[PDB]
Amino acid sequence: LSEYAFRMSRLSARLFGEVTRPTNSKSMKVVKLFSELPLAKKKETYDWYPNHHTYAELMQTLRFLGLYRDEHQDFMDEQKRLKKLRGKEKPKKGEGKRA
Amino acid sequence: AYQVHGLLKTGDNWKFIGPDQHRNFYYSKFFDLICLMEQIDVTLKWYEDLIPSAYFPHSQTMIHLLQALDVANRLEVIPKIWKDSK
Amino acid sequence: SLWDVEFAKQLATVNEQPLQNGFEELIQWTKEGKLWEFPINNEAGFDDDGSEFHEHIFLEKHLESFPKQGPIRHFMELVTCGLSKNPYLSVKQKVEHIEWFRNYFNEKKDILKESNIQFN
Amino acid sequence: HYVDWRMWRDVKRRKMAYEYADERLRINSLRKNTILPKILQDVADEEIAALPRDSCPVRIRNRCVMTSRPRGVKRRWRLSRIVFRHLADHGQLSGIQRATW
Amino acid sequence: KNRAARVRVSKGDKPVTYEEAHAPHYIAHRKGWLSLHTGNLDGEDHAAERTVEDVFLRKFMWGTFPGCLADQLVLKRRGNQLEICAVVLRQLSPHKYYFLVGYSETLLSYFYKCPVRLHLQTVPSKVVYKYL
Amino acid sequence: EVVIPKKKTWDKVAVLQALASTVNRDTTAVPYVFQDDPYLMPASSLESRSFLLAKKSGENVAKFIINSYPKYFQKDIAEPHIPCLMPEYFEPQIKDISEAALKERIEL
Amino acid sequence: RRKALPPRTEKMAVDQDWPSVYPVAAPFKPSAVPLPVRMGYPVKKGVPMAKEGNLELLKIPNFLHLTPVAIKKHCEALKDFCTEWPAALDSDEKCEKHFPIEIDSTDYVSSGPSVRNPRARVVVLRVKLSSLNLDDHAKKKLIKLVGERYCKTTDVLTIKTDRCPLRRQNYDYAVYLLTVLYHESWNTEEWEKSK
Amino acid sequence: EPDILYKRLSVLVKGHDKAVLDSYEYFAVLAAKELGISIKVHEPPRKIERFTLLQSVHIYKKHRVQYEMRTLYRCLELEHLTGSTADVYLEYIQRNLPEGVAMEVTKTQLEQLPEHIKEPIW
Ligand SMILES: [Mg+2]
């Protein structure tokens, strides 16, 4: 290999879309981190979790409007109803260990 | 009757119904005419294509259907149309 | 014209028609603009705003305030050819990173004039 | 209603990582160069260690979207080996069958 | 002892359908997949989105209609088709059923941004295959 | 040698005429907006009336639950954007203007 | 409260055409079918389950909508959008003599309303090199210039392009690359004597 | 405007089962020989994705549960049609596309000559 090859590679670099003057592979790290995307912006990484709080508050209003029948929360308010009905309910804001 | 029927839904189906009463009145009039004026083949076509194409018949429509069936001696499917009328 | 839109609602209530088959369900579903535009391609609507190929390849038109032969122009050739081969970014975003590099490289001119070579 | 903070903080890290992407991209472009000499890279290091926490995708923990377990996760469907086995043994996810070889 | 979502017969007193009476070692043999989509074939993107859409869809469609599903859903899936065909108990009025069918059409079609047509096959009771 | 035919160019309307319009009309037909299954068919015109009004009243309370929470249907996953998928707005964004506030408080 | 309606199975007569009955790809409501086919792993002293409640019939698609006579009807109504592959261009050697440059495209489908595909933007350009006006130094220079992009055995230069996400843009890019390669093949530069 | 012509084009259909796309290749081959498209039928060898999960939840490692993933392969070679006709047959597939199979469309289009390539100096 000599400058016949170096000039053919340089003109095919100006042709096909690679960098014409030679460089290090450590400096080709910047062209491979620039020839693609950062990690954070991919549609399956920052949107790994969907906005789950919209789903939760959606079902919360649909139960509150009586359109969805949320059996788990009916059962949970049943057991909470029994728990307040027995005599061992939640303390008030300001009552606790210090009473 | 042939003019409004060919203009009904094949060429341009604007001539069908704005109300529910438009469809009911057009179907009832054409079915009573095809039952009490035409023969048994067109009356069977009315039983397949207006009373079955729309919903069930009216009271005078059922009386016209019963009279047209008594003209052509067909008192066999009177009970299904009777349940449709009731 | 409000009476013209009421006239169009008159057009709807005269031209209302029932469905008869699944072909007519797909008549409604096709004229509603719902389903895809058959036969399917994937460049429909997502088009990178009508840029040419030469607006992707030849990026020499964004590299004015930069030197000619030296280390930093070599660095700018590297980031220019890096944004050349990236088809996940639009050309506007690429010029935005280009102007950030220009603004940063002339912002901290103290060490760059300590670098014993002149950056433009 | 959400109850937990390990799952919520992983979503916190995901969104604040999504924000701090191109700035760290430009700083690490200043980092990894044999050209563009040392002191520029060292003030780049000062800058990037001076960035706030919860801002780098190093912290990303691919937990489950149904039970938030850190470990035993498929990245193909982003949930745990328990709940995927739950809905696979019921028979809803197409193509996945139990292997009779 | 492996116990899946299968039926563990106690006496001849439990009316069980065809679906619950087959264990998941029969899936490629004697059963059929509830949903069907190309998201599990390779290559294909958008998989976990398809799964969360199916799971939320089935739990929503059950918890909305109280006892009006004799079995689980059938979510066939073709591009811009989320086609519902379920089996409902012949208990309530069909006026209310059409109310709820239009309700699910509108809510799903505006939530997941897709044309949905519902279909129902009414069954007079719980469908039984075995007294197991 | 080589003839080149010039492109016959058509739209979505052409495939309607080509596949949908080459069908006949159904013999036993109930209007297809309802189901075909035996339990839920109408047997009177009052049945079809209450069916269609049940469908549209579900649609009306559906559009009411949509506009009562406009921040719940905004996350878009579909690409080509069928335009009926966003709710409508009755709010004014201009107050210090006069003609824009009048138009955006009456016609909007 | 409670009603009782029979299906259309008794209602539809024997000679009703199936495009009127099953037009399009159905989720199979068994009200309309007059065909009594059972499916299921049956019990030992019993029967396979019938079509009523048959979820196995609901997950498995019928091909009843594709009536072959209705396939024929839709074909003969689709006679109008057609053209003709011209009869000089049937034997493929003559097609290469009239068109020796081929451009490939890529398109896929996906479950779900989202349409985008990342692997659907490459247009690989395929040129058989024996149709060009390439002289001897010029062909030698094109080989030295492309390197490995050209299949030496059957003389097919293959150039891939994915530096931009549009098919027409990469196609114009490969055409531009061929255009500047066939700029360059003629020109003998200064160091080509220093060989 | 003249038409874009193809020497060849291809729709590859792959599914989870065999019967659906065998019946669909029968539909496609009769749609081909009944519209004069001249395809062949051919099967690439299969792929089976087999991964492994833990069966228990706290500790029983020696017993695992494998899940298969069968992927079949069924291609067609669509030759010698123009742009409009390719839109016809591609529409007649993609209006009848099932819910379990896939589709990959790869047309091999035609072009005579680039512009400044005849006798160019830039
Ligand atoms: Mg065991």
Swiss-Prot record, chain D:
Component of the mitochondrial small ribosomal subunit (mt-SSU). Mature mammalian 55S mitochondrial ribosomes consist of a small (28S) and a large (39S) subunit. The 28S small subunit contains a 12S ribosomal RNA (12S mt-rRNA) and 30 different proteins. The 39S large subunit contains a 16S rRNA (16S mt-rRNA), a copy of mitochondrial valine transfer RNA (mt-tRNA(Val)), which plays an integral structural role, and 52 different proteins. Interacts with LIAT1. Keywords: Disease variant, Mitochondrion, Primary mitochondrial disease, Ribonucleoprotein, Ribosomal protein. Disulfide bonds: none annotated. Belongs to the universal ribosomal protein uS14 family. It is linked to Combined oxidative phosphorylation deficiency 38: An autosomal recessive disorder due to mitochondrial dysfunction and characterized by perinatal hypertrophic cardiomyopathy, growth retardation, muscle hypotonia, elevated lactate, dysmorphy and intellectual disability. The keyword Ribosomal protein applies. It comes from Homo sapiens (Human). It comes from the Eukaryota. One of its GO terms (biological process) is translation. It is found in: Mitochondrion. The chain holds residues 28 to 128 of 128 of the full protein. This is Small ribosomal subunit protein uS14m. GO terms for molecular function: RNA binding; structural constituent of ribosome. The keyword Ribonucleoprotein applies. GO terms for cellular component: mitochondrial inner membrane; mitochondrial ribosome; mitochondrial small ribosomal subunit; mitochondrion; nuclear membrane.
UniProtKB/Swiss-Prot annotation, chain F:
The modification N6-acetyllysine is found at K71. It is found in: Mitochondrion. Abundant in testes, skeletal muscle and heart tissue. It comes from the Eukaryota. Component of the mitochondrial small ribosomal subunit (mt-SSU). Mature mammalian 55S mitochondrial ribosomes consist of a small (28S) and a large (39S) subunit. The 28S small subunit contains a 12S ribosomal RNA (12S mt-rRNA) and 30 different proteins. The 39S large subunit contains a 16S rRNA (16S mt-rRNA), a copy of mitochondrial valine transfer RNA (mt-tRNA(Val)), which plays an integral structural role, and 52 different proteins. Associated with the 12S mitochondrial rRNA (12S mt-rRNA). Belongs to the mitochondrion-specific ribosomal protein mS39 family. Mitochondrial RNA-binding protein that has a role in mitochondrial translation. It is linked to Combined oxidative phosphorylation deficiency 51: An autosomal recessive, mitochondrial disorder characterized by intrauterine growth retardation, low birth weight, poor overall growth, progressive limb rigidity, delayed psychomotor development, hearing loss, and optic atrophy. Brain imaging shows abnormal bilateral signs at the basal ganglia and brainstem. Patient cells show decreased mitochondrial complex I and IV levels and activities, and generalized mitochondrial translation defects. This is Small ribosomal subunit protein mS39.
Swiss-Prot record, chain G:
It is found in: Mitochondrion. The keyword Repeat does not apply. GO terms for biological process: mitochondrial translation. The lineage of its organism: Eukaryota, Metazoa, Chordata, Craniata, Vertebrata. Belongs to the mitochondrion-specific ribosomal protein mS35 family. It comes from the Eukaryota. The keyword Glycosyltransferase does not apply. This is Small ribosomal subunit protein mS35. Keywords: Coiled coil, Mitochondrion, Ribonucleoprotein, Ribosomal protein, Transit peptide. GO terms for cellular component: cytosol; mitochondrial inner membrane; mitochondrial small ribosomal subunit; mitochondrion. Component of the mitochondrial small ribosomal subunit (mt-SSU). Mature mammalian 55S mitochondrial ribosomes consist of a small (28S) and a large (39S) subunit. The 28S small subunit contains a 12S ribosomal RNA (12S mt-rRNA) and 30 different proteins. The 39S large subunit contains a 16S rRNA (16S mt-rRNA), a copy of mitochondrial valine transfer RNA (mt-tRNA(Val)), which plays an integral structural role, and 52 different proteins. It comes from Homo sapiens (Human). GO terms for molecular function: RNA binding; structural constituent of ribosome.
Swiss-Prot record, chain H:
Belongs to the universal ribosomal protein uS10 family. Keywords: Mitochondrion, Ribonucleoprotein, Ribosomal protein. The keyword Cell division does not apply. GO terms for cellular component: mitochondrial inner membrane; mitochondrial matrix; mitochondrial small ribosomal subunit; mitochondrion. Coiled coil: none annotated. GO terms for biological process: mitochondrial translation. It is found in: Mitochondrion. Its main location: mitochondrion. Component of the mitochondrial small ribosomal subunit (mt-SSU). Mature mammalian 55S mitochondrial ribosomes consist of a small (28S) and a large (39S) subunit. The 28S small subunit contains a 12S ribosomal RNA (12S mt-rRNA) and 30 different proteins. The 39S large subunit contains a 16S rRNA (16S mt-rRNA), a copy of mitochondrial valine transfer RNA (mt-tRNA(Val)), which plays an integral structural role, and 52 different proteins. The keyword Ribonucleoprotein applies. This is Small ribosomal subunit protein uS10m.
